[PDB]
Ligand binder design. Structure first.
Ligand SMILES: [Ca+2]
Ligand SMILES: [Cl-]
Length: 91
DNA sequence: TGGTTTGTTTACCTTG
DNA sequence: CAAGGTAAACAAACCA
């Protein structure tokens, strides 16, 4: 009752923002964001396997695409997925 | 090849 | 209504 969600008061977008800001280069691929969640948010420490992360990972992809505060940056690297970063121009 | 990952959207509930 | 969390439909790109 003192916390919006199980993991705390931060929204998914806030958590993504934190993960990104935590990197020296201020950019992370989707899987690095997943990694950061499982290593940094107590609540997800265990929800990391295949059968249990399906849902929150869906929520993360959803948040990345929906909010303009996050921009997708091309990574050819042949087969590598996009770098996700905070929109310079704000949300 | 066929299953998985990454991304984009739209929909559905619940709160405030 | 708006915001968020959660589901899900779809498809291009990957990859075992
Ligand atoms: Ca976006
Ligand atoms: Cl697409």
């Amino acid at each position: 009752s003192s916390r919006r969600n199980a993991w705390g008061n931060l929204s998914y977008a806030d958590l993504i923002t934190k993960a990104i800001e935590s990197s020296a280069e201020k950019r992370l691929t989707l899987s690095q964001i997943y990694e950061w969640m499982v290593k940094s948010v107590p609540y997800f420490k265990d929800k990391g396997d295949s059968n249990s992360s399906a849902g929150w990972k869906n929520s993360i992809r959803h948040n990345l695409s929906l909010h303009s505060k996050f921009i997708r940056v091309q990574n050819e690297g042949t087969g590598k997925s996009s770098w996700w970063m905070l929109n310079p121009e704000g949300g």
